[PDB]
């Protein structure tokens, strides 16, 4: 997809005015620089490949990271799935109002030894389990209970030292597009909850160790990476100016439009 | 000449002697729902003359240092004739609008407005943890005003109405990406927009969800010499187009 | 028993790759697509619309709507300067936050010509002419009308047609320019001067204002996507 090349021009004196227009009509001008001056015939070989949608969004970015301790009670992590807990992916998705994409979820799991007290600590390789629960199903509440038996829930196992795990998830929604904004309540009496958090129901994500409590505590940490594929976008939007403050809504504090210079003529 | 239009709809007619062109949506005219995208299981009701007409909202006064107004369109017509009666008895419904903002002045005044029509405008509350209530977001056929100073955080449930952030967090200058027209009092007298139905679901409820918002922001403020008439009003006139409803129930 | 050999680059996680991956939900049936109006096929459909430029910062108008209005009075002498700013659409604080500049701050290189639309939002009887110059670099910023008329300019008269389009051409030694600030690939200066005065009849307010839009022409292109510096985060939300 190349761009338009500039044709030659000649000096004119006529009744045709390409420069003088009216911008009250909500119509930006289609003026080419070969209309207000004298140009030469140049050929453009540049391309708009990197400014397409799929080359703009299909890049991996972290969304959340949680820790959990091996030799403990309540050592297992959980996370409701939403893309509004970071500041560099959330700003990119709020350029469009409605989106539609697949994913390629990728986890990077690290580990770190805790200050144990016993001597001659030798640990084997650790094993981790990432369980995905669709919205509505039973949730586990302890590290060892029998709800971790994933009778139907898809879940991956992973030992340390290998390549990071990766799975792909298709477009799981009720409506035809992920609505990034929702101006309206959730109940017909117009009370209580207002805004985007009435559409967010995409399921949770449970993580835990598989090995037992051998001789020394281990505190792990898992980071999650999104990657949208086959993206379509509708209804573009001005980009966010003020900083984010909350996850569930768009509350902000007012700030100036730009930073300031000293006068109107100083370059 | 390219300065006269005559829009007729139902039993009403809007004529103008000095106006710009007609900005139509994102390049698409409002049409009915086809059978490829339909999801309801039953027959829709198309009144098509009792609703598709020009309703006129309430006037607002353009003072010398004003800030702006907004209307939250799909329930501004909640009490307006037979459009406000089919909205209560039905469960679903899709529409497309035809906004026509008009404001006239002499050849000695000056000023400039910006008439946008944004879809899915989430507003921000004054307090950080709270969210604005229903009464402060939309008025029944009456404009809510912006404020040239900022709203304090000590208020519980109030819309943050600083004009230079437009209530949504974006810069106010970047609002021109939406369909929009300028009412410049030098050359223009009215602005027209034709908006199609923009939503992710083919039919939506009308009482819980306001999928459009019409904002009017004065960029160059109204100024006149002493002696001229100081009272300049602004009137908005909305007309739905190709409306159909579904799912009959009791009144609510 | 096919003999293979793993090359370097195995078992790494490159954040910008393109591979296949096994699905977690087999035989899922997605929701069918719908013709929602206004589909963006490319990011350069966004940066060809107008956006009002805050040319009037001056540290008192940045927290107001006063920043977009350029003041124009009726003088007593000729050749005064209306405004002036260098043309760096990714680093200069004037063009930093418009819709054009907010896409260039995601990329690194850019190339093409830039339009500049003005609109005289004054009275109906006021008249005057303006000069809209553009000086490629190498010299300083022009100081007078006599020095600024040498570059690329256009003389604009206000009438029934209110608007005017100065189209800054693409004059550069390289095929691209940096978004961030650089001495080596500077682009020049944009100035504007009174050609004649602004005459008004009696009982008319004297000071008229001017808006100024910006957009890109149909040969604009970007390259080398990066992250943006206009956002900041310390903890999660």
């Amino acid at each position: 997809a190349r761009v338009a090349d500039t044709i030659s021009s000649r000096p004119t004196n006529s009744e045709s005015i390409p420069a003088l227009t009216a911008a009250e009509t909500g119509h930006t001008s289609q003026v080419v620089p070969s209309d207000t001056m004298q140009t030469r015939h140049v050929k453009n070989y540049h391309s708009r490949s990197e400014s397409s949608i799929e080359n703009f969004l299909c890049r991996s970015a972290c969304v959340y990271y949680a820790t959990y301790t091996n030799n403990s009670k309540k050592g297992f992590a959980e996370w409701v799935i939403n893309t509004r807990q970071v500041a560099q992916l959330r700003r990119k998705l709020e350029l469009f109002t409605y989106l539609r994409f697949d994913l390629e979820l990728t986890f990077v799991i690290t580990s770190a030894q805790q200050p144990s007290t016993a001597s001659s600590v030798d640990a084997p390789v650790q094993t981790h389990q990432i369980m995905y629960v669709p919205p509505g199903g039973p949730v586990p509440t302890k590290v060892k209970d029998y709800a971790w038996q994933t009778s139907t829930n898809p879940s991956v196992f992973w030992t340390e030292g290998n390549a990071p795990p990766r799975m792909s998830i298709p477009f799981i929604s009720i409506g035809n597009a992920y609505s990034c904004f929702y101006d309206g309540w959730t109940q017909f009496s117009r009370n209580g909850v207002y805004g985007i958090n009435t559409l967010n129901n995409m399921g949770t994500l449970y993580m835990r160790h598989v090995n037992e409590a051998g001789q020394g505590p281990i505190k792990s940490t898992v980071r999650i990476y999104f990657k949208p594929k086959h993206v379509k976008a509708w209804v573009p939007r001005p980009p966010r100016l003020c900083q984010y403050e909350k996850q569930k809504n768009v509350n902000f504090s007012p700030i100036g439009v730009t930073t300031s210079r000293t006068d109107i003529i100083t370059t | 000449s390219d300065r006269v239009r005559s829009i007729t709809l139902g039993n009403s007619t809007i004529t103008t002697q000095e106006c710009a062109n007609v900005v139509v949506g994102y390049g698409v005219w409002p049409e009915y729902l086809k059978d490829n995208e339909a999801t309801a299981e039953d027959q829709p009701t198309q009144p098509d003359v009792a609703t598709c007409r020009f309703y006129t909202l309430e006037s607002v006064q353009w003072m010398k240092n004003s800030a702006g107004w907004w209307w939250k369109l799909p329930d501004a017509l909640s009490q307006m004739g037979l459009f406000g009666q089919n909205m209560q008895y039905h469960y679903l419904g899709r529409t497309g609008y035809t906004i026509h903002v008009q404001c006239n002045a002499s050849k000695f005044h000056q000023g400039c407005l910006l008439v946008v029509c944004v879809p899915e405008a989430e507003m921000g509350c004054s307090n950080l943890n709270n969210t604005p209530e229903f009464s402060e977001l939309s008025g029944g056929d009456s404009a809510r005003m912006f404020t040239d100073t900022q709203v304090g955080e000590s208020n519980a449930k109030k819309v943050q109405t600083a004009v230079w952030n437009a209530g949504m967090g974006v810069g106010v200058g970047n609002l021109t990406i939406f369909p929009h027209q300028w009412i410049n009092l030098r050359t223009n007298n009215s602005a027209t927009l034709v908006m199609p139905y923009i939503n992710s679901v083919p039919m939506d409820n009308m009482f819980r969800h306001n999928n459009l918002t019409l904002m009017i922001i004065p960029f160059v403020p109204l100024n006149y010499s002493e002696g001229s008439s100081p009272y300049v009003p602004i009137t908005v006139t909305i007309a739905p187009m190709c409306a159909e409803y579904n799912g009959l129930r009791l009144a609510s | 028993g096919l003999p293979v050999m793993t090359t370097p680059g195995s078992t790494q996680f490159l954040t910008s790759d393109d591979f296949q991956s096994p699905s977690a939900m087999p035989q899922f049936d997605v929701t069918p697509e719908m013709q929602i109006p206004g589909r963006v096929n490319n990011l350069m459909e966004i940066a060809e619309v107008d956006s009002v430029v805050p040319v009037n910062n001056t540290e008192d108008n940045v927290s107001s709507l006063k920043a977009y209005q350029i003041p124009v009075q009726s003088n007593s002498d000729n050749g005064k300067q209306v405004f002036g700013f260098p043309l760096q659409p990714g680093a200069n604080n004037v063009l930093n936050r418009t819709l054009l500049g907010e896409i260039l701050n995601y990329y690194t290189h850019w190339s093409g010509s830039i339009k500049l639309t003005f609109m005289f939002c004054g009275s109906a009887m006021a008249t005057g002419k303006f000069l809209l110059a553009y000086s490629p670099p190498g010299a300083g910023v022009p100081k007078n009308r006599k020095d600024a008329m040498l570059g690329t300019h256009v003389i604009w008269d206000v009438g029934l047609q209110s608007s005017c389009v100065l189209c800054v051409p693409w004059i550069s030694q390289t095929h691209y320019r940096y978004v961030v600030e650089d001495e080596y690939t500077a682009a020049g200066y944009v100035t504007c001067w009174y050609q004649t005065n602004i005459v008004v009849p009696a009982d008319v307010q004297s000071s008229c204002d001017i808006l100024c839009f910006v957009s890109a022409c149909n040969d604009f292109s970007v390259r080398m996507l990066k992250d943006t510096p206009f956002i900041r985060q310390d903890t999660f939300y």
């Epitope: - | 004003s66 404020t147 040239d148 304090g152 | 107001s64 006063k66």
Partner: antibody, heavy 124, light 107 residues
Framework: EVKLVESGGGLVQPGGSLSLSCAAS????????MNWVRQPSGKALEWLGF??????????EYSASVKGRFTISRDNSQSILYLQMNALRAEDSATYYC????????????????WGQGTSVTVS | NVLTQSPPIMSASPGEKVTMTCRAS???????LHWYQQKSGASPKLWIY???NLASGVPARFSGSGSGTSYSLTISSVEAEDAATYYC?????????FGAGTKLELK
């Protein structure tokens, strides 16, 4: 010229109510922000709240310590300003001013240019 | 947010160069800083607005400056009429706060 006088002060018992009034003359009352600033005996100033003009909808903006107990309002007929006091304590004894403000550029800086002569309110 | 003025009590002979400071805790904009003047037992009065602009009725000896979190007010020569108290006002968020006050003593 700008002239603001006020009256209504005096000794009022703790827990009581009180109504102050600030009268304005010499300018159009519906175009200027009107503030309420109090000051204790020989101490620093303290701002209580203001009331916007007709162009912004006559909303009020109180401080953090006086919300729920105080109330600013104006009358529609003539140029007169009110201040409703409720649930007074011992530390509400001060000198109460009534200041005006205006737009300096095209914008609104937050200075208070013309001040009232100062009425006294004490409690016991 | 809180303002700190320093020093609180200052003496001044006629003819000397005199300056007082007004230091904020957090950063304020330069357009929202003002300076007031209150004499002995009278109403206050606006003296400097937006940290560099002289108000109405003020002589041309007064001149303020500063940026960020440090600001100053400089008088060229001390007279017998400008012996009073000076406050500084800021606004970054609600509420508007005032300084402690700088008391100027004639000598």
């Amino acid at each position: 010229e700008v002239k603001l006088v006020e009256s209504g002060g005096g000794l009022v018992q703790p827990g009581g109510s009180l109504s102050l009034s600030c009268a304005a003359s010499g300018f159009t009352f519906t175009d200027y922000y009107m503030n309420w600033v109090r000051q204790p005996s020989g101490k620093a100033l303290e701002w209580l709240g203001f009331l916007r003009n007709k162009a912004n909808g006559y909303t009020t903006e109180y401080s953090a310590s006086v919300k729920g107990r105080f109330t600013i309002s104006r009358d529609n007929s003539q140029s007169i300003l009110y201040l409703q006091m409720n649930a007074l304590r011992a530390e509400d004894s001060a000198t109460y001013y009534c200041a005006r403000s205006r737009y300096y550029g095209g914008t609104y800086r937050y200075a208070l240019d013309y001040w009232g002569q100062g009425t006294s309110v004490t409690v016991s | 947010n809180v303002l700190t003025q320093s020093p609180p009590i200052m003496s001044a002979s006629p003819g000397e160069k005199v300056t007082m400071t007004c230091r904020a805790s957090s950063s304020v904009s330069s357009s929202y800083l003002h300076w007031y003047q209150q004499k002995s037992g009278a109403s206050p009065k606006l003296w400097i607005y937006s940290t560099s602009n002289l108000a109405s009725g003020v002589p041309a000896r007064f001149s303020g400056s500063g940026s960020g979190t440090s600001y100053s007010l400089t008088i060229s020569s001390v007279e017998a009429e400008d012996a009073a108290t000076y406050y500084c006002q800021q606004f970054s968020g609600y509420p508007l706060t005032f300084g402690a006050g700088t008391k100027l003593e004639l000598k």
